[PDB]
Design a protein around this ligand. Structure first.
Ligand SMILES: [K+]
Ligand SMILES: [K+]
Ligand SMILES: [K+]
Ligand SMILES: [K+]
Ligand SMILES: [K+]
Ligand SMILES: [K+]
Ligand SMILES: [K+]
Ligand SMILES: [K+]
Ligand SMILES: [K+]
Ligand SMILES: [K+]
Ligand SMILES: [K+]
Ligand SMILES: [K+]
Ligand SMILES: [K+]
Ligand SMILES: [K+]
Ligand SMILES: [Mg+2]
Ligand SMILES: [Mg+2]
Ligand SMILES: [Mg+2]
Ligand SMILES: [Mg+2]
Ligand SMILES: [Mg+2]
Ligand SMILES: [Mg+2]
Ligand SMILES: [Mg+2]
Ligand SMILES: [Mg+2]
Ligand SMILES: [Mg+2]
Ligand SMILES: [Mg+2]
Ligand SMILES: [Mg+2]
Ligand SMILES: [Mg+2]
Ligand SMILES: [Mg+2]
Ligand SMILES: [Mg+2]
Ligand SMILES: [Mg+2]
Ligand SMILES: [Mg+2]
Ligand SMILES: [Mg+2]
Ligand SMILES: [Mg+2]
Ligand SMILES: [Mg+2]
Ligand SMILES: [Mg+2]
Ligand SMILES: [Mg+2]
Ligand SMILES: [Mg+2]
Ligand SMILES: [Mg+2]
Lengths: 153, 100, 84, 206
RNA sequence: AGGUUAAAACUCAAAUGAAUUGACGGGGGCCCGCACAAGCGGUGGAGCAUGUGGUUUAAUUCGAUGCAACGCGAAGAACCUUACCUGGUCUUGACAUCCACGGAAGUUUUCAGAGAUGAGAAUGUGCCUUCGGGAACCGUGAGACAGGUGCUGCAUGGCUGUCGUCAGCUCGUGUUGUGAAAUGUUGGGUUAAGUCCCGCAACGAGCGCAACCCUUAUCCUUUGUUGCCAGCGGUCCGGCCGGGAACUCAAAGGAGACUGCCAGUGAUAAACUGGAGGAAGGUGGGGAUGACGUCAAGUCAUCAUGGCCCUUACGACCAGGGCUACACACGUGCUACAAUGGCGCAUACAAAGAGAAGCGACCUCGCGAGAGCAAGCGGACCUCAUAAAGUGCGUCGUAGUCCGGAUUGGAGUCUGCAACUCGACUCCAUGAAGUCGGAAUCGCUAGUAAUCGUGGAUCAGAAUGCCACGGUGAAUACGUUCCCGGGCCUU
């Protein structure tokens, strides 16, 4: 906004693990305010991921987030003349938000049976650097690299 | 509203009041489950003989100061415009601008 | 439709007209404005001129018309298509 | 833009209601209609009596009408003859025993309804509207109002194009809820049509 | 190339200079707003509801009709409503006052019509009354008159939208200028604010801002039934009973929030940033509240009103029809396209409100909508009245399907004189389009969006609209370069 008067809102940690990171992931996945449904989906997918891999749910989730998190994005900047796509560094909070949003969108786009299964498959693919939201991170990085010459506007 | 339109309503009210019970007992006979199959027919035929204006369903609530047939309010007997005017003048007891 | 426990509806004037017509050989059309009357199995054969709003159209009552209202056979709106 | 009614917005804060009775939904509309008819008859009958306010109460199976007037002698008549006649007619209209009380409006120049009616009578008598409004404002200010505003709208002076003209003195703080603002309107039926008059009078904050 | 000298006819009532107030600029500077940006969910695609344009019609009544008309007047068109059409009828008249005459008013039936209505046929003939009269209410007779939703919102009052809840708009006296005008109101800061401080040819004042109002968040006192159950005593385990006044709560009166305190910054100012305490911290959240004015904006069909117009008709009554039409176009919505789901069983947790020609329990009957009988309640007591989403278990396994529920056939229920045109709801069967929607476009910054149910006005019956109530409950805002609207100074 113009006035710069927006603070921050505290978020309760998730029940099973007490991680605000996972609580934010549940919030992103939630639709129509059905938080219990979102939590059940997330927990089922996390248990499937944990039994697929050798790490805990939090460790596997962190691996997937590390593989999907972007570092530099492109934003439009209009100056005297034409608008340029300037590459800008992404702050850590936005890195996490983008990683979660891309993962959720990719899982929703997948075509498996259940949403929990789709989320588990997407998380495993992210941990192995395959599939969507990983291609999305790659596309964002490619655009930033192509527009690197404009990193002074 | 027009004077004739107001007179229609007063006539309808008068007719309904006059024929109130003579309609009620006929309707009771018609709706009686244990009634015969010919007294029901006679009651049905007799109900049509009464003037149509005696049925209470023919009445249309109208503003008691203007005759407006739309925007009626039963609690005050007036249309919305007249209710607003009286409320602002302070003539409706206990009624003020609400806010919550 | 009308409840069974109340029986089919019929206007008293039309009932009197059909009673006076069936016993006699009167084949003249029975002019009426009562489109709300159910067709009863007692006036099959004679023609009833039902009002449609601006005129009386004659319907020849047959057996298959029993149970329908008189107005069902007197259309009220004139339509011939757009730009036809 | 449009403004809220100054009396209505203050009806529960600093201003009293003009009707004080309780009823259920069964008789609320009937009571409202009878009050309307009573006020109509009283206003028509006491046209020259300088009636400013008609308060109606219904204690129990009876009607009590308080008439605020600047000419109580004209209202009452000789040994209560006129007020007795009005009591009879009011009882007949309301269908219940009637009791009429007379309240004194001292300083009629500080009463919004009376000022508006006076201006309206002058306009119907073809007095200059400017002179009428200036006189009303000056009288109220001299009597000691903290403020007054007078507004006249219509075909002033028989002009083909209607307009609105207003004068104000002192302060008339219409946005202050606790301000004692007496507001009233009147209409004049001249040969060129209807002219509306509105009067606000400020009497200090409570 | 052209220069230089240099007319006239005809034509207009101006052409022009400087300066003033605005408005405007693809001029400058500084600010604000779901205005962008960051996000979430929609519309435009489908079916249906609803309004409008058009077309059609005897009539499809009239009005609104860039933003600021299009689920708008209408908070509810089968008859009525109704203002429109066809047909049948009346003329001081459906609705008032005045005069003359006959008569109590009223009730009960017959015929004709289709009704309006006409012709009758019986029953009463009361009530003050000096029993001269009346004085209600009817009918007839004239004529002053009644009547008009007929026209002009560009003659008007009243009421409303709108820029915009934007921070603005002005006046008195003084002073400057021949004058229009200017100053104040500009400037340095600051604020949500023409908010406040400082400066200053201005000194003051008014309408606006803020506050006073309602509601919500905390606490205290009083009162304690129909509301409550902590300590007790019983108990059919049901606050059920004796009780208790603690608690939730109901509603009256108070307290509390004021940059009040601390630190830093700042012009020894206004103020800003952070901290403590507190339920709440900087306008705590929401509402009400709409300045001078603008659009000859809307409404003569709520009402009122100047003028005009009709008067055996543009007035009045009735029946039937129409306002519900349908090659099409647009706006606003509802339901979906599914598995974060459908279906079956079981099982929790709300708030707000209404009710007497009303809400209607229990029991019985019916697959069901409902029906019969019949308590209680003008209500913290009774009824409406099971909240749903949610959770547990099972199944469906990606299919135009156990998705979707449009359309149609048959059979019913209820309201209502009367469901054909044209009501709502139920049962059986039927099972359309639709698999996430082009250009384009809308709403929203927090208990919001999204999603889930509940109630109310209108109302005999007739909500997917409108108004209101709770449950669950997000994402994102780096920033002001750009789009839209606006504020201040300057050019
Ligand atoms: K020459
Ligand atoms: K010349
Ligand atoms: K769409
Ligand atoms: K408009
Ligand atoms: K107007
Ligand atoms: K000068
Ligand atoms: K001056
Ligand atoms: K007029
Ligand atoms: K109709
Ligand atoms: K809808
Ligand atoms: K739509
Ligand atoms: K199906
Ligand atoms: K119907
Ligand atoms: K400018
Ligand atoms: Mg009228
Ligand atoms: Mg009705
Ligand atoms: Mg010039
Ligand atoms: Mg955007
Ligand atoms: Mg569509
Ligand atoms: Mg129209
Ligand atoms: Mg028009
Ligand atoms: Mg709307
Ligand atoms: Mg109709
Ligand atoms: Mg206008
Ligand atoms: Mg200014
Ligand atoms: Mg100035
Ligand atoms: Mg101020
Ligand atoms: Mg100054
Ligand atoms: Mg204010
Ligand atoms: Mg206009
Ligand atoms: Mg118009
Ligand atoms: Mg009709
Ligand atoms: Mg319509
Ligand atoms: Mg299905
Ligand atoms: Mg906002
Ligand atoms: Mg209803
Ligand atoms: Mg400003």
């Amino acid at each position: 906004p113009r006035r710069r008067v927006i603070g921050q809102r505290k978020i309760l940690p998730d029940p099973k693990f007490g991680s605000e990171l996972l609580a934010k992931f549940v919030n992103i996945l939630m639709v129509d305010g059905k938080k219990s449904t979102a939590e059940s989906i997330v927990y089922s997918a996390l248990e499937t991921l944990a039994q697929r891999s050798g790490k805990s749910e939090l460790e596997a989730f962190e691996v997937a987030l590390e593989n999907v998190r972007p570092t530099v994005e492109v934003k439009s900047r209009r100056v005297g003349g034409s608008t340029y796509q300037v590459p800008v560094e992404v702050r850590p909070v936005r890195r996490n938000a983008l990683a979660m949003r891309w993962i959720v969108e990719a899982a929703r786009k997948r075509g498996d049976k259940s949403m929990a299964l789709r989320l588990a498959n997407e998380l495993s693919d992210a941990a192995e650097n395959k599939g969507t939201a990983v291609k999305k991170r790659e596309d964002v990085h490619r655009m930033a690299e192509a527009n690197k010459a404009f990193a002074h506007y | 509203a027009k004077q004739s339109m107001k007179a229609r309503e007063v006539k309808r009210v008068a007719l309904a009041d006059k024929y109130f019970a003579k309609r009620a007992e006929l309707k009771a006979i018609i709706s009686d489950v244990n009634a015969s199959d010919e007294d029901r027919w006679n009651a049905v035929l007799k109900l049509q003989t009464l003037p149509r204006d005696s049925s209470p369903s023919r009445q249309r609530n109208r503003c008691r100061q203007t005759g407006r047939p739309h925007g009626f309010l039963r609690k005050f007997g007036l249309s919305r415009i007249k209710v607003r005017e009286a409320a602002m003048r302070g003539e409706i007891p206990g009624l003020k601008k609400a806010s919550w | 439709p009308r409840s069974l426990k109340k029986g089919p509806f019929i206007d008293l004037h039309l009932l009197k007209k059909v009673e006076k017509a069936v016993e006699s050989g009167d084949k003249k059309p029975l002019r009426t404005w009562s489109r709300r009357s159910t067709i009863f199995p007692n006036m099959i054969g004679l023609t009833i001129a039902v009002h449609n709003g601006r005129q009386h159209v004659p319907v020849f009552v047959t057996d298959e018309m029993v149970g329908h209202k008189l107005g069902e056979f007197a259309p009220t709106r004139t339509y011939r298509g757009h730009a036809a | 833009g449009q403004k809220v009614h100054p009396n209505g917005i203050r009806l529960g804060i600093v201003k009293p209601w003009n009707s004080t009775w309780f009823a259920n939904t069964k008789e609320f509309a009937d009571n409202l209609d009878s009050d309307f008819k009573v006020r109509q008859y009283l206003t028509k009958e006491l046209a020259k009596a300088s009636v400013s306010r008609i308060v109606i109460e219904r204690p129990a199976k009876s009607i009590r009408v308080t008439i605020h007037t600047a000419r109580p002698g004209i209202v009452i008549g000789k040994k209560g003859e006129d007020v007795e006649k009005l009591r009879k007619v009011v009882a007949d209209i309301a269908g219940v025993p009637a009791q009429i009380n007379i309240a004194e409006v001292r300083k009629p120049e500080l009463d919004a309804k009376l000022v508006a009616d006076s201006i309206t009578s002058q306009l119907e008598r073809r007095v200059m509207f400017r002179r009428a409004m200036k006189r009303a404002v000056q009288n109220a200010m001299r009597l000691g109002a903290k403020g007054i505003k007078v507004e006249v709208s219509g075909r002033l002076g028989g002009a083909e194009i209607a307009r609105t003209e207003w004068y104000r003195e002192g302060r008339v703080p219409l946005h202050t809820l606790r301000a004692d603002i007496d507001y009233n309107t009147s209409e004049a039926h001249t040969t060129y049509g209807v002219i509306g008059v509105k009067v606000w009078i400020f009497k200090g904050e409570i």
